[PDB]
mmCIF file of C-alpha atoms in Angstrom:
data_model
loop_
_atom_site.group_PDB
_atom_site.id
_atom_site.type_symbol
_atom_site.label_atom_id
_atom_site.label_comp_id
_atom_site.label_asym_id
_atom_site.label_seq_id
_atom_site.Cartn_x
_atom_site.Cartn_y
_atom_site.Cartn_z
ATOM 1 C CA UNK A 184 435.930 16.830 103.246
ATOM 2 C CA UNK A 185 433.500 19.223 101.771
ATOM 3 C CA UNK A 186 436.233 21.725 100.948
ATOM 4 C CA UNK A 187 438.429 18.704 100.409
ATOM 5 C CA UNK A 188 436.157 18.033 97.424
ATOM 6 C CA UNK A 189 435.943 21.421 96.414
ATOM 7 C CA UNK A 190 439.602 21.840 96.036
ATOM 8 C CA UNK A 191 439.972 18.417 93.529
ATOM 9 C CA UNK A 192 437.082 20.129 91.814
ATOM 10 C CA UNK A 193 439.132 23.267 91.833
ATOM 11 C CA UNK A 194 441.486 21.223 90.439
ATOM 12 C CA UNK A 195 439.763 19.254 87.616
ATOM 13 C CA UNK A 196 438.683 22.245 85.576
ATOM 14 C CA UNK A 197 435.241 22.489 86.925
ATOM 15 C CA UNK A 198 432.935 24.980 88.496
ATOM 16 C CA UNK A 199 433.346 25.330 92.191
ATOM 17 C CA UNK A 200 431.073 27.645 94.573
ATOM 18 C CA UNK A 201 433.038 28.483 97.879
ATOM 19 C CA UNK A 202 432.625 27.380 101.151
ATOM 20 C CA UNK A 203 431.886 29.665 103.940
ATOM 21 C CA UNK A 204 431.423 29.162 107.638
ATOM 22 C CA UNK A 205 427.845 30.162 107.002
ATOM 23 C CA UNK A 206 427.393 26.772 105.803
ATOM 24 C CA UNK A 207 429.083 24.883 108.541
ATOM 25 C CA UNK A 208 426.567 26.810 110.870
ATOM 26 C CA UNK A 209 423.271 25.934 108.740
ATOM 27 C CA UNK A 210 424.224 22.374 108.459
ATOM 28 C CA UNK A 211 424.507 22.362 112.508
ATOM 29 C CA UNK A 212 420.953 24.210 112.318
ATOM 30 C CA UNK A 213 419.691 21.472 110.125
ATOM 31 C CA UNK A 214 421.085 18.949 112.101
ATOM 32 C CA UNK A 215 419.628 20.007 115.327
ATOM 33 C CA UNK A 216 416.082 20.879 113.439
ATOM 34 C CA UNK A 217 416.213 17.494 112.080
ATOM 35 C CA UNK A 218 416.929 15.576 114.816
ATOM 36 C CA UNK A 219 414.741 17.048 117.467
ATOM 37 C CA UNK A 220 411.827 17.080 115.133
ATOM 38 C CA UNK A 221 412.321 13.093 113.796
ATOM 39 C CA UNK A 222 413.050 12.403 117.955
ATOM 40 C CA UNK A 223 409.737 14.247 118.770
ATOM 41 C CA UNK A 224 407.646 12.703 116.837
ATOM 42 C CA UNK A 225 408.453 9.196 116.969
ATOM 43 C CA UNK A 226 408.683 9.516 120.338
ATOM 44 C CA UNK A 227 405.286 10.814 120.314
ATOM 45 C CA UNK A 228 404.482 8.139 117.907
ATOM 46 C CA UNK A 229 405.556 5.704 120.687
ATOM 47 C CA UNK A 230 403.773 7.008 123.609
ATOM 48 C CA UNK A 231 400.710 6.988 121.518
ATOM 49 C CA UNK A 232 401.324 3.161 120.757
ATOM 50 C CA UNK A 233 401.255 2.554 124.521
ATOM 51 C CA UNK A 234 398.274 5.412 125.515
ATOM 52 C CA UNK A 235 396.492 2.818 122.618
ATOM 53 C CA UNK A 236 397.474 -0.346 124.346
ATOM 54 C CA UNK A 237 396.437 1.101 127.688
ATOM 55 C CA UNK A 238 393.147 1.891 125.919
ATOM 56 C CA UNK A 239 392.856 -1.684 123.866
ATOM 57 C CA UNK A 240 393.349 -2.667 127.969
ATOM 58 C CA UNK A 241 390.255 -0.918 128.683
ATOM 59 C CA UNK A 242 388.298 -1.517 126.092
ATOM 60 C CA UNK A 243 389.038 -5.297 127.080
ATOM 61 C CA UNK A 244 387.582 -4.443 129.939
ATOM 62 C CA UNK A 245 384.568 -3.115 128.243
ATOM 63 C CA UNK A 246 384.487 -6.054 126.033
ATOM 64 C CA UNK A 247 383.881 -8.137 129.312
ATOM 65 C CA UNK A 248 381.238 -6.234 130.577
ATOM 66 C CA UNK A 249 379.320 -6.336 127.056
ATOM 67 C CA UNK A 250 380.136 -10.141 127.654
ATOM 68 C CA UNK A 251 378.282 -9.508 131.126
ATOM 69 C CA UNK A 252 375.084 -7.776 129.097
ATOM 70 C CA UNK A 253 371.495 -13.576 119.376
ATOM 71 C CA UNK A 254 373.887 -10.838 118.911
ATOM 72 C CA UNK A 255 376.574 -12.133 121.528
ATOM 73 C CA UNK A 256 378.952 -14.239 119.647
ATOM 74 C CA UNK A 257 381.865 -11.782 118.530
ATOM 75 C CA UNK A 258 384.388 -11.598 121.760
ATOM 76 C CA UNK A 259 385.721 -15.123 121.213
ATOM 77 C CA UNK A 260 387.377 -13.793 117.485
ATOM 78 C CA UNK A 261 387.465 -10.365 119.248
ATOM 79 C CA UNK A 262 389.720 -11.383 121.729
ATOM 80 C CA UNK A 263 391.834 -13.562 119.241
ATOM 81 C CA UNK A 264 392.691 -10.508 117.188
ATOM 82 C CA UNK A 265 393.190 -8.784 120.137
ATOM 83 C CA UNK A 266 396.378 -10.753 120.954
ATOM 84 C CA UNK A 267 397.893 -10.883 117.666
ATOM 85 C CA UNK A 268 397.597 -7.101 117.689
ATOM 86 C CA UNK A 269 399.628 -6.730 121.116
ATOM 87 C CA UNK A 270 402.163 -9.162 120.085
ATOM 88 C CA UNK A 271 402.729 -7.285 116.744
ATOM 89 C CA UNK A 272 402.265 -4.128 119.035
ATOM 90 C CA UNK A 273 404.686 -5.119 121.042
ATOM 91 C CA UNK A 274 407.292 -6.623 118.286
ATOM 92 C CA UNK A 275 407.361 -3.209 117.094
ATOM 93 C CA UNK A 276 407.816 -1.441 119.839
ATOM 94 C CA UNK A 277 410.715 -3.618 119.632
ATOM 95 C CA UNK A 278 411.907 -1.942 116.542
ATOM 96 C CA UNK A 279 411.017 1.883 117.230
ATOM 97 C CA UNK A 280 413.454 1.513 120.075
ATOM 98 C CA UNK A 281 416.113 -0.101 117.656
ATOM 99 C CA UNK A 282 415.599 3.014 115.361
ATOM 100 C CA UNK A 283 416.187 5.368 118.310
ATOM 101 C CA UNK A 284 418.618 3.753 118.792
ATOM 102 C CA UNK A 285 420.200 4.519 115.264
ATOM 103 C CA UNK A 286 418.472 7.267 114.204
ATOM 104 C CA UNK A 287 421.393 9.638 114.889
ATOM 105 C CA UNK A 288 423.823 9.024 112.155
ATOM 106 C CA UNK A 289 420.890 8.981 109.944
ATOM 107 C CA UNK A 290 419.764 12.603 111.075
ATOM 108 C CA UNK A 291 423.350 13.661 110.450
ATOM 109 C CA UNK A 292 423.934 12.193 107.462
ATOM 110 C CA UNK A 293 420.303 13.679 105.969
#
């Protein structure tokens, strides 16, 4: 299609700039740049989503012990954040693996 497009500009009466091979080979470099970079990262982005939950699981736990030791009255609203914060963790880890999911026509087509 790109030299499809180049030919009807050919056509028209406008200025056209050939197409070469050389392009076909830097749009499969930017393709696989692209795409291994985005997938790296929000990958990475996702493992550190869990690593954090695993630590918001310890720090629970930490939480309790402080429980266990007038400035005592904080876990109760502590805790009830807590839980919103994993459900809206978890709601989008949800969506990260929906955009995995997708992410690879949108690498191609960028």
């Amino acid at each position: 299609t790109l030299h499809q497009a180049n030919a009807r500009l050919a056509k028209r009466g406008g200025r056209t700039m050939a197409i070469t091979p050389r392009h076909y080979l830097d749009f499969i470099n930017h393709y696989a740049n692209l795409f291994h970079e985005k997938r790296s990262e929000l990958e990475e982005q996702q493992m550190h989503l869990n690593v954090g939950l695993r630590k918001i699981k310890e720090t629970v736990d930490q939480v309790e012990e402080l429980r266990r030791d007038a400035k005592v009255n904080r876990s109760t609203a502590l805790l009830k954040s807590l839980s919103a914060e994993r459900e809206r963790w978890e709601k989008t880890s949800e969506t990260f693996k929906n955009q995995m999911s997708t992410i690879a026509g949108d690498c191609l087509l960028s």
